[PDB]
Design an enzyme around this catalytic site. Structure first.
Site, PDB file in Angstrom:
ATOM      1  N   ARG A 254     -62.346  30.775 -14.682  1.00  0.00           N
ATOM      2  CA  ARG A 254     -60.888  30.920 -14.760  1.00  0.00           C
ATOM      3  C   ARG A 254     -60.411  32.400 -14.863  1.00  0.00           C
ATOM      4  O   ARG A 254     -61.085  33.232 -15.482  1.00  0.00           O
ATOM      5  CB  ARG A 254     -60.362  30.083 -15.970  1.00  0.00           C
ATOM      6  N   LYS A 269     -66.990  22.808 -20.672  1.00  0.00           N
ATOM      7  CA  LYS A 269     -66.484  21.665 -21.447  1.00  0.00           C
ATOM      8  C   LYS A 269     -67.595  20.612 -21.548  1.00  0.00           C
ATOM      9  O   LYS A 269     -68.049  20.097 -20.513  1.00  0.00           O
ATOM     10  CB  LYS A 269     -65.229  21.067 -20.773  1.00  0.00           C
ATOM     11  N   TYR A 347     -52.045  26.403 -10.634  1.00  0.00           N
ATOM     12  CA  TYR A 347     -50.811  25.937 -11.306  1.00  0.00           C
ATOM     13  C   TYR A 347     -50.161  27.050 -12.126  1.00  0.00           C
ATOM     14  O   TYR A 347     -50.868  27.915 -12.677  1.00  0.00           O
ATOM     15  CB  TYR A 347     -51.081  24.676 -12.210  1.00  0.00           C
ATOM     16  N   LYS A 446     -57.737  17.587 -13.737  1.00  0.00           N
ATOM     17  CA  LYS A 446     -57.415  18.331 -12.493  1.00  0.00           C
ATOM     18  C   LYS A 446     -58.678  18.399 -11.596  1.00  0.00           C
ATOM     19  O   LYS A 446     -58.568  18.324 -10.358  1.00  0.00           O
ATOM     20  CB  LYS A 446     -56.917  19.765 -12.821  1.00  0.00           C
TER      21      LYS A 446
END
Length: 467
Positions: A254, A269, A347, A446
Protein backbone atom coordinates in the site's frame (compact mmCIF):
# COMPACT_ATOMS: atom_id res chain seq x y z
CA UNK A 1 37.67 39.08 32.28
CA UNK A 2 37.76 36.58 35.25
CA UNK A 3 33.85 36.59 35.65
CA UNK A 4 33.51 36.52 31.80
CA UNK A 5 35.78 33.38 31.47
CA UNK A 6 34.17 31.65 34.62
CA UNK A 7 30.59 31.86 33.07
CA UNK A 8 32.18 30.90 29.61
CA UNK A 9 33.45 27.48 31.01
CA UNK A 10 29.71 26.49 31.76
CA UNK A 11 29.29 25.89 27.88
CA UNK A 12 28.10 22.72 25.95
CA UNK A 13 31.42 20.64 26.31
CA UNK A 14 30.32 18.49 23.21
CA UNK A 15 31.02 21.59 20.90
CA UNK A 16 33.88 23.29 23.10
CA UNK A 17 36.15 23.87 19.96
CA UNK A 18 33.57 25.91 17.89
CA UNK A 19 33.04 28.39 20.89
CA UNK A 20 34.96 31.79 21.02
CA UNK A 21 38.67 31.34 22.10
CA UNK A 22 38.20 33.98 24.98
CA UNK A 23 41.30 32.70 26.96
CA UNK A 24 43.51 32.66 23.73
CA UNK A 25 42.31 36.23 22.70
CA UNK A 26 42.78 37.45 26.42
CA UNK A 27 46.45 36.12 26.48
CA UNK A 28 47.10 37.60 22.91
CA UNK A 29 46.28 41.14 24.32
CA UNK A 30 48.33 40.75 27.63
CA UNK A 31 51.44 39.07 25.93
CA UNK A 32 51.55 41.79 23.16
CA UNK A 33 51.09 44.50 25.95
CA UNK A 34 54.04 42.82 27.93
CA UNK A 35 56.24 43.58 24.82
CA UNK A 36 56.52 47.22 23.25
CA UNK A 37 56.32 48.45 27.06
CA UNK A 38 52.46 48.74 27.60
CA UNK A 39 51.91 50.46 24.18
CA UNK A 40 49.49 49.14 21.47
CA UNK A 41 50.12 50.03 17.75
CA UNK A 42 48.14 49.90 14.33
CA UNK A 43 50.24 46.77 13.28
CA UNK A 44 49.27 45.10 16.67
CA UNK A 45 45.54 46.07 15.99
CA UNK A 46 45.50 44.28 12.48
CA UNK A 47 46.91 41.02 14.11
CA UNK A 48 44.13 41.09 16.85
CA UNK A 49 41.32 41.94 14.28
CA UNK A 50 42.63 39.03 12.01
CA UNK A 51 42.33 36.61 15.04
CA UNK A 52 38.69 37.88 15.67
CA UNK A 53 37.85 37.25 11.94
CA UNK A 54 39.09 33.55 12.22
CA UNK A 55 36.89 33.21 15.44
CA UNK A 56 33.80 34.88 13.75
CA UNK A 57 34.10 32.61 10.61
CA UNK A 58 34.38 29.51 12.96
CA UNK A 59 31.20 30.52 15.03
CA UNK A 60 29.15 31.66 11.84
CA UNK A 61 29.90 28.38 9.82
CA UNK A 62 29.01 26.12 12.87
CA UNK A 63 25.67 28.07 13.37
CA UNK A 64 25.03 27.70 9.54
CA UNK A 65 25.85 23.86 9.63
CA UNK A 66 23.65 23.15 12.79
CA UNK A 67 20.80 25.35 11.20
CA UNK A 68 20.72 22.90 8.18
CA UNK A 69 20.74 19.86 10.62
CA UNK A 70 17.63 20.97 12.74
CA UNK A 71 15.71 22.06 9.52
CA UNK A 72 16.44 18.55 7.98
CA UNK A 73 15.39 16.72 11.30
CA UNK A 74 11.99 18.64 11.31
CA UNK A 75 11.44 17.98 7.46
CA UNK A 76 12.04 14.18 8.12
CA UNK A 77 9.68 13.93 11.26
CA UNK A 78 7.02 16.06 9.30
CA UNK A 79 7.01 13.22 6.65
CA UNK A 80 6.98 10.59 9.56
CA UNK A 81 3.89 12.22 11.33
CA UNK A 82 2.08 12.58 7.86
CA UNK A 83 2.58 8.74 7.37
CA UNK A 84 1.27 7.83 10.97
CA UNK A 85 -1.82 10.25 10.58
CA UNK A 86 -2.59 8.51 7.16
CA UNK A 87 -2.29 5.10 9.07
CA UNK A 88 -5.01 6.12 11.74
CA UNK A 89 -7.86 5.39 9.16
CA UNK A 90 -6.54 1.83 8.24
CA UNK A 91 -7.59 -1.54 10.00
CA UNK A 92 -4.30 -1.42 12.06
CA UNK A 93 -4.02 2.22 13.55
CA UNK A 94 -0.60 3.30 15.20
CA UNK A 95 -0.21 2.20 18.91
CA UNK A 96 0.38 4.62 21.96
CA UNK A 97 4.17 3.59 21.79
CA UNK A 98 4.39 4.83 18.05
CA UNK A 99 3.34 8.39 19.21
CA UNK A 100 5.74 8.15 22.30
CA UNK A 101 8.74 7.55 19.83
CA UNK A 102 7.63 10.70 17.73
CA UNK A 103 7.30 12.70 21.07
CA UNK A 104 10.89 11.49 22.15
CA UNK A 105 12.29 12.53 18.68
CA UNK A 106 10.45 15.97 18.74
CA UNK A 107 11.74 16.62 22.38
CA UNK A 108 15.31 15.69 21.13
CA UNK A 109 14.95 18.34 18.27
CA UNK A 110 13.54 20.91 20.93
CA UNK A 111 16.84 20.28 22.94
CA UNK A 112 18.96 20.74 19.66
CA UNK A 113 17.21 24.17 18.89
CA UNK A 114 17.66 25.08 22.69
CA UNK A 115 21.48 24.18 22.60
CA UNK A 116 21.84 26.23 19.33
CA UNK A 117 20.09 29.27 21.03
CA UNK A 118 22.44 28.86 24.15
CA UNK A 119 25.56 28.64 21.78
CA UNK A 120 24.66 31.94 19.96
CA UNK A 121 23.81 34.01 23.15
CA UNK A 122 27.08 32.87 24.97
CA UNK A 123 29.33 33.58 21.86
CA UNK A 124 27.61 37.06 21.34
CA UNK A 125 28.29 37.89 25.10
CA UNK A 126 31.87 36.45 24.65
CA UNK A 127 32.57 38.83 21.68
CA UNK A 128 31.08 41.87 23.57
CA UNK A 129 33.16 40.99 26.77
CA UNK A 130 36.55 40.49 24.88
CA UNK A 131 36.00 43.93 23.07
CA UNK A 132 35.06 45.51 26.57
CA UNK A 133 38.48 44.13 27.86
CA UNK A 134 40.21 45.36 24.57
CA UNK A 135 38.88 48.99 25.06
CA UNK A 136 39.99 48.82 28.81
CA UNK A 137 43.55 47.18 28.47
CA UNK A 138 44.23 49.06 25.09
CA UNK A 139 43.57 52.77 24.13
CA UNK A 140 41.94 51.74 20.74
CA UNK A 141 38.05 51.60 20.82
CA UNK A 142 36.18 48.69 19.03
CA UNK A 143 32.74 48.88 20.97
CA UNK A 144 30.75 50.68 18.00
CA UNK A 145 32.52 48.39 15.41
CA UNK A 146 31.38 44.94 16.79
CA UNK A 147 27.98 46.02 18.39
CA UNK A 148 26.75 47.19 14.86
CA UNK A 149 28.37 44.18 12.93
CA UNK A 150 26.73 41.58 15.34
CA UNK A 151 23.18 43.20 15.88
CA UNK A 152 22.72 43.04 12.03
CA UNK A 153 23.41 39.43 10.67
CA UNK A 154 23.33 37.52 14.17
CA UNK A 155 24.62 33.95 15.01
CA UNK A 156 21.01 32.72 15.67
CA UNK A 157 18.86 33.29 12.50
CA UNK A 158 15.30 34.82 12.39
CA UNK A 159 14.12 31.55 10.53
CA UNK A 160 13.74 29.69 13.96
CA UNK A 161 10.36 31.50 14.84
CA UNK A 162 8.80 29.76 11.69
CA UNK A 163 10.44 26.40 12.88
CA UNK A 164 9.04 26.85 16.57
CA UNK A 165 5.38 27.10 15.13
CA UNK A 166 5.96 23.91 12.95
CA UNK A 167 7.66 21.96 15.91
CA UNK A 168 4.57 22.87 18.13
CA UNK A 169 2.11 21.74 15.32
CA UNK A 170 3.80 18.23 15.08
CA UNK A 171 4.13 18.00 18.98
CA UNK A 172 0.33 18.81 19.38
CA UNK A 173 -0.47 15.86 16.93
CA UNK A 174 1.58 13.45 19.23
CA UNK A 175 -0.16 15.03 22.37
CA UNK A 176 -3.85 14.95 21.06
CA UNK A 177 -3.59 11.43 19.36
CA UNK A 178 -2.02 9.95 22.56
CA UNK A 179 -4.51 8.60 25.30
CA UNK A 180 -8.02 -1.31 29.33
CA UNK A 181 -10.82 -4.01 28.78
CA UNK A 182 -13.30 -3.24 25.88
CA UNK A 183 -15.23 -5.02 23.01
CA UNK A 184 -14.05 -4.34 19.33
CA UNK A 185 -16.72 -4.37 16.50
CA UNK A 186 -15.70 -3.79 12.78
CA UNK A 187 -18.62 -3.56 10.23
CA UNK A 188 -18.66 -2.71 6.44
CA UNK A 189 -21.59 -0.99 4.55
CA UNK A 190 -22.58 -0.28 0.85
CA UNK A 191 -23.54 3.41 0.22
CA UNK A 192 -25.37 4.61 -2.96
CA UNK A 193 -23.49 7.55 -4.88
CA UNK A 194 -26.61 9.81 -4.22
CA UNK A 195 -26.16 9.28 -0.37
CA UNK A 196 -22.24 9.98 -0.30
CA UNK A 197 -22.46 13.86 0.38
CA UNK A 198 -25.59 13.39 2.67
CA UNK A 199 -23.65 10.76 4.80
CA UNK A 200 -20.41 12.97 4.93
CA UNK A 201 -22.46 15.98 6.36
CA UNK A 202 -24.06 13.76 9.14
CA UNK A 203 -20.71 12.18 10.43
CA UNK A 204 -18.65 15.59 10.27
CA UNK A 205 -21.14 17.03 12.95
CA UNK A 206 -19.83 14.33 15.49
CA UNK A 207 -16.35 13.13 14.19
CA UNK A 208 -14.04 15.68 12.31
CA UNK A 209 -12.47 14.94 8.83
CA UNK A 210 -8.85 13.74 9.43
CA UNK A 211 -6.32 16.00 7.52
CA UNK A 212 -2.60 14.88 7.26
CA UNK A 213 -0.41 17.91 6.02
CA UNK A 214 -2.86 20.88 6.97
CA UNK A 215 -0.04 23.53 6.11
CA UNK A 216 -0.80 22.89 2.26
CA UNK A 217 -3.77 23.47 -0.20
CA UNK A 218 -6.33 20.55 -0.68
CA UNK A 219 -5.22 18.23 -3.59
CA UNK A 220 -7.16 15.35 -5.41
CA UNK A 221 -4.19 12.84 -4.89
CA UNK A 222 -4.15 13.50 -1.00
CA UNK A 223 -7.35 11.40 -0.22
CA UNK A 224 -6.26 8.52 -2.64
CA UNK A 225 -5.20 5.02 -1.31
CA UNK A 226 -3.82 2.26 -3.66
CA UNK A 227 -3.17 -1.37 -2.49
CA UNK A 228 -1.51 -4.13 -4.65
CA UNK A 229 -2.82 -7.57 -3.47
CA UNK A 230 -0.50 -10.60 -3.94
CA UNK A 231 -1.42 -14.26 -4.77
CA UNK A 232 -0.23 -17.32 -6.90
CA UNK A 233 -1.58 -18.94 -10.22
CA UNK A 234 -3.73 -21.46 -8.14
CA UNK A 235 -5.08 -18.31 -6.13
CA UNK A 236 -4.36 -20.18 -2.74
CA UNK A 237 -4.46 -16.93 -0.60
CA UNK A 238 -7.90 -15.91 -2.12
CA UNK A 239 -9.60 -19.28 -1.20
CA UNK A 240 -8.02 -19.12 2.30
CA UNK A 241 -9.47 -15.61 3.00
CA UNK A 242 -12.88 -16.56 1.39
CA UNK A 243 -13.20 -19.93 3.37
CA UNK A 244 -11.72 -18.09 6.56
CA UNK A 245 -9.14 -20.92 7.31
CA UNK A 246 -6.81 -20.94 10.44
CA UNK A 247 -3.73 -18.72 9.76
CA UNK A 248 -5.10 -17.53 6.31
CA UNK A 249 -2.81 -14.68 5.13
CA UNK A 250 -3.59 -11.64 2.91
CA UNK A 251 -0.51 -9.85 1.39
CA UNK A 252 -0.64 -6.25 0.05
CA UNK A 253 1.71 -3.32 -0.83
CA UNK A 254 0.00 0.00 0.00
CA UNK A 255 0.94 3.71 -0.72
CA UNK A 256 -0.81 6.99 0.29
CA UNK A 257 -1.06 9.76 -2.34
CA UNK A 258 0.19 10.12 -5.95
CA UNK A 259 2.96 8.26 -7.91
CA UNK A 260 5.66 10.57 -6.30
CA UNK A 261 5.04 8.57 -2.93
CA UNK A 262 8.41 7.44 -1.45
CA UNK A 263 7.17 5.07 1.38
CA UNK A 264 5.56 1.65 0.41
CA UNK A 265 3.84 -0.24 3.29
CA UNK A 266 4.30 -4.07 3.17
CA UNK A 267 0.95 -5.02 4.89
CA UNK A 268 -0.15 -8.55 6.08
CA UNK A 269 -3.61 -9.66 7.43
CA UNK A 270 -3.74 -13.08 9.27
CA UNK A 271 -7.11 -14.75 10.18
CA UNK A 272 -7.07 -16.45 13.65
CA UNK A 273 -9.92 -18.60 15.12
CA UNK A 274 -10.53 -19.16 18.92
CA UNK A 275 -13.37 -19.68 21.59
CA UNK A 276 -13.79 -15.81 22.03
CA UNK A 277 -14.70 -15.44 18.26
CA UNK A 278 -13.04 -14.26 14.98
CA UNK A 279 -9.74 -12.26 15.30
CA UNK A 280 -7.76 -10.64 12.43
CA UNK A 281 -4.04 -10.13 13.41
CA UNK A 282 -2.76 -7.18 11.26
CA UNK A 283 1.01 -6.38 11.00
CA UNK A 284 3.22 -4.20 8.63
CA UNK A 285 6.60 -2.35 7.93
CA UNK A 286 7.87 0.60 5.74
CA UNK A 287 10.02 0.06 2.54
CA UNK A 288 11.40 2.40 -0.27
CA UNK A 289 9.93 1.87 -3.88
CA UNK A 290 13.53 1.29 -5.34
CA UNK A 291 14.07 -1.69 -2.83
CA UNK A 292 10.51 -3.35 -3.22
CA UNK A 293 11.32 -5.33 -6.53
CA UNK A 294 14.57 -6.88 -5.07
CA UNK A 295 12.90 -7.62 -1.62
CA UNK A 296 10.01 -9.75 -3.18
CA UNK A 297 12.68 -11.52 -5.41
CA UNK A 298 14.89 -12.14 -2.26
CA UNK A 299 17.92 -10.10 -3.66
CA UNK A 300 17.33 -7.35 -0.97
CA UNK A 301 17.88 -9.16 2.46
CA UNK A 302 16.08 -8.34 5.85
CA UNK A 303 19.47 -6.98 7.29
CA UNK A 304 19.68 -4.60 4.18
CA UNK A 305 16.00 -3.35 4.90
CA UNK A 306 16.76 -2.31 8.56
CA UNK A 307 20.47 -1.27 7.75
CA UNK A 308 19.71 2.55 8.16
CA UNK A 309 17.09 1.76 10.98
CA UNK A 310 19.69 -0.14 13.22
CA UNK A 311 22.49 2.58 13.02
CA UNK A 312 19.88 5.27 14.22
CA UNK A 313 19.27 3.34 17.54
CA UNK A 314 16.08 5.08 18.85
CA UNK A 315 13.56 2.09 18.65
CA UNK A 316 13.25 -0.70 21.45
CA UNK A 317 15.58 -3.82 20.95
CA UNK A 318 12.48 -6.16 21.15
CA UNK A 319 10.47 -4.03 18.55
CA UNK A 320 13.40 -4.00 15.90
CA UNK A 321 13.69 -7.91 15.91
CA UNK A 322 9.74 -8.11 15.83
CA UNK A 323 9.76 -6.10 12.50
CA UNK A 324 12.82 -8.24 11.30
CA UNK A 325 10.93 -11.58 12.03
CA UNK A 326 7.79 -10.10 10.23
CA UNK A 327 9.90 -9.06 7.11
CA UNK A 328 11.53 -12.60 6.89
CA UNK A 329 8.01 -14.24 7.27
CA UNK A 330 6.48 -12.21 4.30
CA UNK A 331 9.70 -12.71 2.08
CA UNK A 332 9.47 -16.56 2.80
CA UNK A 333 5.62 -16.81 1.94
CA UNK A 334 6.38 -14.63 -1.25
CA UNK A 335 9.00 -17.24 -2.55
CA UNK A 336 7.61 -20.61 -1.05
CA UNK A 337 3.98 -20.01 -2.33
CA UNK A 338 5.47 -18.21 -5.53
CA UNK A 339 3.23 -15.05 -5.11
CA UNK A 340 2.92 -12.24 -7.75
CA UNK A 341 0.68 -8.97 -8.21
CA UNK A 342 -2.96 -10.13 -8.86
CA UNK A 343 -5.49 -7.29 -8.06
CA UNK A 344 -5.11 -3.47 -7.46
CA UNK A 345 -7.62 -1.68 -5.15
CA UNK A 346 -7.95 2.13 -5.74
CA UNK A 347 -10.25 4.46 -3.67
CA UNK A 348 -10.39 8.01 -2.20
CA UNK A 349 -10.83 7.70 1.62
CA UNK A 350 -12.45 10.36 3.85
CA UNK A 351 -11.53 9.57 7.53
CA UNK A 352 -13.79 10.72 10.42
CA UNK A 353 -12.33 10.49 14.03
CA UNK A 354 -11.70 12.54 17.22
CA UNK A 355 -7.92 12.76 18.30
CA UNK A 356 -7.09 10.31 21.15
CA UNK A 357 -10.57 8.67 20.90
CA UNK A 358 -10.95 5.11 19.46
CA UNK A 359 -14.67 4.58 20.76
CA UNK A 360 -16.14 5.41 17.23
CA UNK A 361 -13.85 5.51 14.07
CA UNK A 362 -15.63 5.81 10.63
CA UNK A 363 -14.12 6.03 7.03
CA UNK A 364 -15.85 6.44 3.59
CA UNK A 365 -14.21 4.80 0.50
CA UNK A 366 -15.33 6.64 -2.72
CA UNK A 367 -14.38 6.05 -6.48
CA UNK A 368 -13.66 2.31 -5.59
CA UNK A 369 -11.99 0.39 -8.50
CA UNK A 370 -10.53 -3.13 -9.03
CA UNK A 371 -7.59 -3.30 -11.56
CA UNK A 372 -5.98 -6.55 -13.03
CA UNK A 373 -2.24 -6.90 -12.11
CA UNK A 374 -1.84 -10.66 -13.09
CA UNK A 375 -0.35 -12.40 -16.28
CA UNK A 376 -2.69 -15.58 -16.19
CA UNK A 377 -4.44 -14.61 -19.54
CA UNK A 378 -0.93 -14.34 -21.22
CA UNK A 379 -0.78 -10.48 -20.93
CA UNK A 380 2.26 -8.92 -19.09
CA UNK A 381 0.59 -5.86 -17.33
CA UNK A 382 3.28 -5.23 -14.59
CA UNK A 383 6.20 -5.83 -17.17
CA UNK A 384 8.03 -7.59 -14.22
CA UNK A 385 7.59 -4.83 -11.58
CA UNK A 386 5.54 -4.85 -8.26
CA UNK A 387 2.75 -2.57 -9.90
CA UNK A 388 1.25 -1.33 -13.28
CA UNK A 389 3.04 1.78 -14.70
CA UNK A 390 0.26 2.60 -17.39
CA UNK A 391 -2.14 3.60 -14.52
CA UNK A 392 -1.50 5.70 -11.39
CA UNK A 393 -4.08 7.76 -9.38
CA UNK A 394 -5.76 9.19 -12.69
CA UNK A 395 -9.40 7.79 -11.96
CA UNK A 396 -11.64 6.40 -13.73
CA UNK A 397 -8.48 5.15 -15.75
CA UNK A 398 -10.37 5.21 -19.21
CA UNK A 399 -7.14 3.93 -21.03
CA UNK A 400 -7.59 0.40 -19.40
CA UNK A 401 -9.65 -2.35 -21.15
CA UNK A 402 -13.22 -3.27 -19.81
CA UNK A 403 -12.03 -6.85 -18.76
CA UNK A 404 -9.02 -5.36 -16.71
CA UNK A 405 -11.04 -2.67 -14.75
CA UNK A 406 -14.06 -3.12 -12.33
CA UNK A 407 -15.71 0.24 -11.40
CA UNK A 408 -17.64 -0.54 -8.12
CA UNK A 409 -21.25 1.02 -8.26
CA UNK A 410 -21.26 1.79 -4.44
CA UNK A 411 -19.12 3.50 -1.67
CA UNK A 412 -17.67 1.38 1.21
CA UNK A 413 -18.32 2.74 4.74
CA UNK A 414 -16.02 1.18 7.41
CA UNK A 415 -17.48 1.68 10.97
CA UNK A 416 -14.97 0.57 13.74
CA UNK A 417 -16.47 0.47 17.30
CA UNK A 418 -14.41 0.16 20.54
CA UNK A 419 -17.08 0.45 23.36
CA UNK A 420 -16.19 -0.31 27.08
CA UNK A 421 -17.66 -3.50 28.82
CA UNK A 422 -21.19 -2.79 30.19
CA UNK A 423 -21.77 0.38 28.04
CA UNK A 424 -23.85 1.38 24.90
CA UNK A 425 -22.20 3.42 21.89
CA UNK A 426 -23.56 7.03 21.01
CA UNK A 427 -27.23 7.23 19.73
CA UNK A 428 -26.16 8.97 16.36
CA UNK A 429 -23.93 5.97 15.17
CA UNK A 430 -26.63 3.42 16.46
CA UNK A 431 -29.27 5.31 14.29
CA UNK A 432 -26.83 5.64 11.25
CA UNK A 433 -25.87 1.85 11.03
CA UNK A 434 -29.64 0.89 10.90
CA UNK A 435 -30.69 3.75 8.48
CA UNK A 436 -31.81 3.64 4.71
CA UNK A 437 -28.48 5.44 3.68
CA UNK A 438 -26.34 2.27 4.37
CA UNK A 439 -26.71 -1.42 3.24
CA UNK A 440 -24.94 -3.85 5.79
CA UNK A 441 -22.59 -6.31 3.97
CA UNK A 442 -20.98 -8.78 6.58
CA UNK A 443 -17.18 -9.45 6.15
CA UNK A 444 -16.92 -7.57 2.70
CA UNK A 445 -13.44 -7.56 1.07
CA UNK A 446 -12.00 -5.35 -1.76
CA UNK A 447 -9.43 -8.20 -2.49
CA UNK A 448 -12.08 -11.06 -2.54
CA UNK A 449 -14.51 -8.88 -4.75
CA UNK A 450 -11.70 -7.94 -7.25
CA UNK A 451 -10.33 -11.55 -7.74
CA UNK A 452 -13.91 -13.10 -8.04
CA UNK A 453 -15.10 -10.38 -10.62
CA UNK A 454 -11.93 -9.84 -12.83
CA UNK A 455 -10.77 -13.56 -12.66
CA UNK A 456 -14.34 -15.26 -12.54
CA UNK A 457 -13.15 -17.89 -15.17
CA UNK A 458 -10.17 -19.03 -12.92
CA UNK A 459 -12.24 -19.11 -9.59
CA UNK A 460 -14.77 -21.96 -8.70
CA UNK A 461 -15.95 -20.59 -5.25
CA UNK A 462 -17.41 -16.97 -5.07
CA UNK A 463 -18.77 -14.74 -2.09
CA UNK A 464 -22.54 -14.23 -1.28
CA UNK A 465 -22.51 -10.49 -2.44
CA UNK A 466 -21.87 -11.45 -6.21
CA UNK A 467 -23.37 -10.21 -8.62
Amino acid sequence: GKFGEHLSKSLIRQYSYYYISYDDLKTELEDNLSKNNGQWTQELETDFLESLEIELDKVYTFCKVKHSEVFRRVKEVQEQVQHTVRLLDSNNPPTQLDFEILEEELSDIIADVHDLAKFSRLNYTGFQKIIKKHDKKTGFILKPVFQVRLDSKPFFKENYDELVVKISQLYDIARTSGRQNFVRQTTKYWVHPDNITELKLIILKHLPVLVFNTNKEFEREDSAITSIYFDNENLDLYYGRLRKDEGAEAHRLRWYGGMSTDTIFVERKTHREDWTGEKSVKARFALKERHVNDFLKGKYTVDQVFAKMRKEGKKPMNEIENLEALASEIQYVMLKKKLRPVVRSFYNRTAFQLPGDARVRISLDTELTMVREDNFDGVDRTHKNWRRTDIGVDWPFKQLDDKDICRFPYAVLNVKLQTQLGQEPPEWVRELVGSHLVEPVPKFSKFIHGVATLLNDKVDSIPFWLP
